[PDB]
């Protein structure tokens, strides 16, 4: 019928599309078959109760939820704030230097960031404790203290990603036609009046899409940082579902329970991103 006739013309197009599809079927969807298989050994369905009752894992999902909340709350708005602040800057050279400096830490590797953390926070070595000693605040061992883990995390995280994540929002607020601001200026709108009454509600759909995308990975937050800097003493607060899955699955060589936790985390992620997409659809402009 048609499809054959269209394929005769599009053959060199489909030829382009094929290898990508093959790639996705192999390196992505085949692990889903292996996912359905890793469920049972060594039915099945039982070690989900082992996940249900554990004092190690329940605090891992506990701290996963906690870290999700903190990363959301403190981490998500910061790039928007940075974008708004940069947007209000004049003297383009200054704003340029600022943008360079602030966008820079994103290119710094994660293990190098963690290295900066462990170097700075080392007792009687790092500069932080030295500056604390200069003011007479004494000293604190940070990485061995479970209390300080999350603040250090989110701080290093905003230091690294705030600017690069602010880039998108900055591009979004620069895509607005000047007339909206100028007509407000004729009406005598102040700066805050403008960022509140026009800028923000205009940038809302962008931050909404970025928000649901953020909620997609929200369960996996800080996996590669935690896998690095978590001490046996700080294991309690630092441990996250992804970290649990890694430690048991790859290290402890237990595939079954770790993969089960993987199914749990993936399903909860898909559900929360489904509700996120829905609420960002019905309320806001379009979505994903």
């Amino acid at each position: 019928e048609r499809l054959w006739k269209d394929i005769k013309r599009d053959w060199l197009l489909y030829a382009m599309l094929l290898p990508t599809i093959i790639w996705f079927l192999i390196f992505l969807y085949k692990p889903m078959i292996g996912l359905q298989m890793a469920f049972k050994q060594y039915i099945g369905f039982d070690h989900f109760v082992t996940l249900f009752q554990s004092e190690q894992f329940i605090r891992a999902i506990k701290n996963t939820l906690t870290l999700s909340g903190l990363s959301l709350l403190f981490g998500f708005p910061m790039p928007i704030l940075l974008a708004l602040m940069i947007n209000e800057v004049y003297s383009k050279g200054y704003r340029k230097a600022v943008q360079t400096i602030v966008y820079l830490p994103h290119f710094i590797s994660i293990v190098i960031v963690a290295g900066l953390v462990v170097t700075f926070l080392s007792p009687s070595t790092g500069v932080v404790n030295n500056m604390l000693s200069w003011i007479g605040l004494d000293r604190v061992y940070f990485l061995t203290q479970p209390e300080w883990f999350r603040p250090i995390y989110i701080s290093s995280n905003i230091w690294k990603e705030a600017g690069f994540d602010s880039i998108v929002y900055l591009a979004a607020i620069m895509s607005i036609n000047p007339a909206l601001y100028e007509s407000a200026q004729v009406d005598g709108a102040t700066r805050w009046q403008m960022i509140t009454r026009i800028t923000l509600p205009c940038i809302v759909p962008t931050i909404a899409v970025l928000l649901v995308i953020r909620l997609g990975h929200i369960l996996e937050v800080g996996f590669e940082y935690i896998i690095l800097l978590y001490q046996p003493t700080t294991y309690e607060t630092a441990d996250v579902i992804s970290t649990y899955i890694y430690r048991l699955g790859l290290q402890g060589a237990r595939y079954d329970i770790a993969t089960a936790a993987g199914i749990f985390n993936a399903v909860v992620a898909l559900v929360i991103v489904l509700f996120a997409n829905h609420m960002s659809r019905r309320i806001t402009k379009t979505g994903v």
């Binding site: 036609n177 007339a179 909206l180 007509s183 200026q185 004729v186 009406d187 005598g188 009454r197 809302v204």
Partner: protein, 363 residues
Amino acid sequence: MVASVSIQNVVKRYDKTTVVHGVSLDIEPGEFVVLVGPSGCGKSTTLRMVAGLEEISGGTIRIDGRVINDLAPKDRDVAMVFQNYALYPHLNVRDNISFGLRLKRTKKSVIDAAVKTAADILGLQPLLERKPSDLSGGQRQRVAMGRAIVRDPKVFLFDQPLSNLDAKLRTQMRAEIKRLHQRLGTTVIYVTHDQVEAMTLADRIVVMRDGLIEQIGKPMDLFLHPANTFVASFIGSPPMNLMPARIAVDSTQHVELNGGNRISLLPRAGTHLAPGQEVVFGIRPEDVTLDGVEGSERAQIKATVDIVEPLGSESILHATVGDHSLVVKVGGLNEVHPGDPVTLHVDLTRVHLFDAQSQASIY
């Protein structure tokens, strides 16, 4: 809210440029004045300088007795309609119009009645609960004008309002603008790249090329008596022909162009042009006809038809005199066809001449 506005020697400089140079225009209260010209000049920059959106690098501009140079746009008692869709997408039409008034909040009765009167003027009553996402371009410009009149300023500033619209909507909204000006009667400055809107709307037309103001006057003053060859070229639906020419022979009477064509001139006292003087001769297409002067006494021009463009009840005839070509408006049928010789009859009262070096009238 009826006030005069005086612009004296205003100049705006961006990075050692000076886009506009010493522009001076005085505007009477309740007068419709249009800044018109080609793209690139300071027509929009001037209007923006009046608005306060751009800084004045030199010269002074004032409304009534108050100098607004160091003032703020909010306090300048002016309202501006931009060319591109100044209404906010998330807010509704009613919310759009009441935006500027909602900036200072206060009495909801005032922002209510104001928007009622505005929407009554522009017919924005049914559109009050509507949103800008679904609207016409003309309707957007209407609610923008609603933003303008809800301010009740001393001056209405329009920057190319009808540029983004289509021809139909331009011709419609133009009449609606004139009609609107008949109601309020507020002082208004209007900026256009289109000659038509300038001719129709303005009480006075000021043309500006390259930051310089070329001429001022009534539309008919610019149409009948252009200051130079550029103003002559700019105004009218067809462009004025403007082709090179000389005289010699007889001075005060005859003037000859191109391939040996010769035209007799009316005395027009006060001219005293020179014989042999390099001149650019021009005439309007409406003032040239085909064999319809019934054996004219002045022995009019001769040409050879290039192409024929059927319009409607009228038609556009391109006729080539020598190395140059002039355009003449003709009747609807008129066989003609390209390649066959044709005699064109020129109206002696409507002829215009300019000088080749100094581009001014000199006639």
